[PDB]
Write a protein that binds this ligand. Structure first.
Ligand SMILES: O=c1ccn([C@@H]2O[C@H](COP(=O)(O)OP(=O)(O)O)[C@@H](O)[C@H]2O)c(=O)[nH]1
Ligand SMILES: O=c1ccn([C@@H]2O[C@H](COP(=O)(O)OP(=O)(O)O)[C@@H](O)[C@H]2O)c(=O)[nH]1
Ligand SMILES: O=c1ccn([C@@H]2O[C@H](COP(=O)(O)OP(=O)(O)O)[C@@H](O)[C@H]2O)c(=O)[nH]1
Ligand SMILES: O=c1ccn([C@@H]2O[C@H](COP(=O)(O)OP(=O)(O)O)[C@@H](O)[C@H]2O)c(=O)[nH]1
Ligand SMILES: O=c1ccn([C@@H]2O[C@H](COP(=O)(O)OP(=O)(O)O)[C@@H](O)[C@H]2O)c(=O)[nH]1
Ligand SMILES: O=c1ccn([C@@H]2O[C@H](COP(=O)(O)OP(=O)(O)O)[C@@H](O)[C@H]2O)c(=O)[nH]1
Ligand SMILES: [Mg+2]
Ligand SMILES: [Mg+2]
Ligand SMILES: [Mg+2]
Ligand SMILES: [Mg+2]
Ligand SMILES: [Mg+2]
Ligand SMILES: [Mg+2]
Lengths: 150, 152, 152, 150, 150, 150
C-alpha cells in the first residue's frame, strides 16, 4: 500500500476546471494524497517530461503547450496506485477511453488529454523525484486506512 | 475533422424519466459543441422514416409507435469523431450490454426503453440532421474553449 | 395552478461555459415540466425588445449586445408556482447576492455574466413565451410522474 | 421483470459512507427497491452466507470482517437484476473493476470491496430468504414501470 | 453527539427515486445511520404519524397517501441531528424551501414534500420508538467520529 | 477581478476526502486557482495564523488541531473572491451553515469545520504572504475570463 505515483493535470485540464474533479476521483477511490502543487513547467522541464517522444513530429508543440501555463502535480499513495491511477485516467488516446474515466468523460484529442500518470513503479519514482523536493512530500496516516485495506 | 456532426435524441422514455439535462451535460463535459436543439413530438410517419432501415424487423411497429408516443429532444453535436464518440457516451444499444459510465449503462434496462438515439455513421448523421432540422435552425458559433480541447 | 408557465434562458455565457445540461437538470429534478426548448442566436433587436423595460438603464447597451453575441437556449417550463420557483432556482440577479445551491450562487460571479434569465411574473412570462416560441413549437404532454409531484 | 437479487453494502461501505451512493446507482438504473435494512451480521450468519467458500484461505478473515459491523441489506427487483446488479458493482477484485462501477470508483482491495451481490437467480433466492423475513419485503408498483419496460 | 432523529422518505420520495440521494446527504453531513427500513405504513400508522393534523381538511388524503406505498424509515445519530436533519430537508412547504435542501431541489407541493423529519428531541424519541423495535437499531462506532467531532 | 484570498482545507477536510470537492466548487464558481499545496502546519504556524484569537478559550485546541495533520492551502483569484469564498464555505459554525455551502453540506462541529477562508482583503494579503512564497504563486490568464467577467 505504500506504492506511489505521479499524476498531473495538464494545462488544458487546469484551464477547463477539471482539477477538483480529478482529485475527487482519486480521493473517492481510496488513494492518499502525499504531494500537491500548482506550477508552470519550464520549457526544459517539458522537454524532460516528454523525453521519450523527442523524435516525434509533434514534440515541439507538446513541449510548448505543456510549458504554456500551470499544471497541478500530485503524488498519490496506495496499493497498485501506479496501474490504478492510469485506469482512472483512461486510455491515453481519448478515442479509446471509456466513459467513467477522466479522459472518457472529458477529453477528445490525444494532444489535449487533460492529465498524465506515471507508467510504471520505476518511472513514478523518477517523476516524483523530478517534480517534488523531499521536504514537499507529506507523510500522514489516513484515519480510513483499515477500511480501505485488509 | 472537428467539424463532424451527429444527431443525438433523447427518446420519449428519457424525457419522461428526466434524463434530458443529464444527457446534455455528458456531451458538454466531453468537449462536444451543441449546434442544434429542440423539443418536438415525432409523428408516426417521421418515426417510420427515421427507422426505415429496420422496417422488416419484428420490433419495428413497436419502436415506431413508442418513438412517436411523446416528446423527444433532438440535438446536433459537433466535434472530432463525434458520431462514434457520441455512441460511446450512449453505451451499447441493448442496455444489458451497456457499461456503467455510459448513459444506457447508468440509466436503462430494456432495449425498447433505451433512453436515447445516436446516428451510426457520418452519412446517416448527415441524413438525420437534414431530416430533423432546417438550415436556419442550426447555430454556428465558436466555443471559447476550442483551443483547449483541440491541438489544431 | 400547476399549468403555470415561465420562460427560462441560458444566456450566451452559460452556453459557452457548458452549463446548459446542468441548468436543465435542476429544473427536471425540481419537478417542473419542459414544454419548449430551442437553441437560437438572438438578434440585437430581439434582445432590445426582451429587455425593453430597462432601455433607460446605463447597462442596457452592453446587455443587449452581449445577449445577442452568441447562442442562448430558450426554455418554457410548466408547473405550480414555476415563475417564482424558477427564479429561486436561478438565484439572485446579482451573483454577489446569490446563495450556494442556486445556479448563480454555484456558477456565476458578475451581474453582467449571470448565466441565465427567468421571467419575473406570470404576465411577463406569457409575453416572453409568446415572443420566443411559436404556438406549434410548444409540446403538450403529461408527465407520468404528475401524481407523485402534485397532490391534485 | 420480477426477478430479484440481494445486494449488501459491506461493513467497509457503511463505514465509508457509500450507502446512499450505492442505492442511488440502483435507483438510477431503473431497479425497484423491495427490501432494505441495516443490520449487524453475526459470525454464524457470515459463515452460512459464504458457506461455498469454506475451504478457501481467506474464509476466516472474510467471515470475521463481514460480521465486524453493520451492513445494509437490500432486495432489488427488475429484468436481469441479478446479472445487472453485479455489473453495477463491478468485478469482485477491485484491481479488475472499471471506473463507472461501484468497486471501480471506490475500492482498492479485494478484502475491502465495499459491497456484495447474489451471483445467480438461485443463490439470490436463497440469500433473500436468508436475510429477509417475508414481512420485510414490500410488494408495490413503480409509477415509472412502463417507462423502464416494454 | 448521541442525539437521534427519525427521518422518512415519504411514498413520493421512494416513487421518484430519491432514497439514495437523501441518505447520501445525511452521510455527507457527518450523521450516523443507526436504523433503516423499508415498509408500507398501515392506515392506523398513517393516522398516528399525522395525528396533530387530525382536524385539518386534508388529513384523510394525507393518511391515505402516506399508507399507499412504501416509505424508508431512518434513525440518524449526531450532535444537533434533530434540528440539523430538518435543515437538510428544507422548509416544510417547498414554496419556502431553498435550493441546496432536499425539498428546495426536488419538491413543489406541500402535500408531496418527499420526506419527514422529527421536529424535536422529544417527538424524535416517540417517533423512533413508534417505527422501530429495540432490536432493529444498530449501535456502532464510526471510524470517522474524531474527524467529525471535537 | 485580481483580488485574491487564501482558502485552506483543514486537517479534518483532508482526512475526510473533501479536497477535490472543495476545489471543484471554487472552479465551478469562476474563481481562478493561482496557488495550491499540501503541507503540514507547525504549531507555531497555527498560532500565528490564528494570533487574533490568542485570548479565546478554544485557541489552544484550535492551534493543536490545525497542526495535527496536512492541510491543503490555496490562493484563489477573482472579483469579490474574499467575501465570495467565505459564502461558498458557509457560516463558521456549521450549526448556522446552510445546505449548498461546504460546511452546510459536510460539517457538524465548529471545531471540525473542514475549511478556512481569509476574512478581509487585508487579512487575505497577510495569509497569502504567510503560507506561500512568491515563486509558488502562478500568474496566468484563464481562457474563460471574458465569459465570467464583463
Ligand atoms: O500520438 C501521440 C501520442 C502521444 N501524444 C501525447 O503524449 C503524451 C505522452 O505520451 P505517452 O505515450 O507517454 O502516453 P501516456 O503515458 O500519457 O499514456 C500523451 O499523454 C499525449 O498527450 C500525442 O500527442 N500524440
Ligand atoms: O432487438 C431490438 C433491437 C433494437 N431495438 C430498438 O431499435 C432501435 C434502433 O436499433 P439500431 O440497431 O439502429 O440501434 P442503435 O442505432 O439505436 O444503437 C434501438 O435503439 C432500440 O431502441 C429494439 O427494440 N429491439
Ligand atoms: O446592474 C445591473 C442589473 C442588471 N444587469 C443585467 O440585466 C439583466 C436584467 O435585469 P433584471 O433587473 O431584469 O434582472 P433579472 O430579471 O434577470 O433578475 C440581469 O439578468 C443582468 O444580467 C446588469 O448587467 N447590471
Ligand atoms: O481472493 C479473494 C476472493 C474473494 N474474497 C472475498 O470473498 C468475497 C466472496 O467471493 P466471491 O467469489 O463470492 O465474489 P463475489 O460473489 O463477491 O463477486 C468477495 O466479494 C471478496 O470480498 C477475498 O477476500 N479474496
Ligand atoms: O398545510 C399543510 C401543512 C402540512 N401538510 C403536510 O403535513 C406534513 C406534516 O405537517 P407538519 O406541520 O408536521 O410539517 P413537518 O413537521 O413535516 O415540517 C407536512 O410535511 C406536509 O406534507 C399539508 O399537506 N398541508
Ligand atoms: O467558538 C468557536 C469559534 C471558532 N472556532 C474555530 O476557530 C476558527 C477561527 O475562528 P474565526 O472567528 O476566525 O472563524 P472563520 O474566520 O474560520 O470563519 C473557526 O474557523 C473555528 O474552527 C472554535 O473552535 N470555536
Ligand atoms: Mg507516459
Ligand atoms: Mg441506429
Ligand atoms: Mg428581468
Ligand atoms: Mg458470492
Ligand atoms: Mg412534523
Ligand atoms: Mg478567521
Amino acid at each position: 500500500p505504500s506504492e506511489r505515483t505521479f499524476i498531473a493535470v495538464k494545462p488544458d485540464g487546469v484551464q477547463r476546471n477539471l482539477v477538483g474533479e480529478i482529485i475527487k476521483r482519486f480521493e473517492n477511490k481510496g488513494y492518499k494524497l502525499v504531494g500537491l502543487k500548482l506550477l508552470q513547467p519550464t520549457e526544459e522541464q517539458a522537454k524532460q517530461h516528454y523525453i521519450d517522444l523527442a523524435s516525434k513530429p509533434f514534440y515541439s508543440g507538446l513541449v510548448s503547450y505543456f510549458s504554456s501555463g500551470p499544471i497541478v502535480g500530485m503524488v498519490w499513495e496506495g496499493l497498485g496506485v501506479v496501474k490504478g491511477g492510469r485506469v482512472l485516467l483512461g486510455a491515453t488516446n481519448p478515442a479509446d477511453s471509456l466513459p467513467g474515466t477522466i479522459r472518457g468523460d472529458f477529453a477528445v484529442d490525444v494532444g489535449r488529454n487533460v492529465c498524465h500518470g506515471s507508467d510504471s513503479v520505476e518511472s513514478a519514482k523518477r517523476e516524483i523525484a523530478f517534480w517534488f523536493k523531499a521536504e514537499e512530500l507529506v507523510s500522514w496516516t489516513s484515519h480510513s486506512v483499515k477500511q480501505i485495506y485488509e
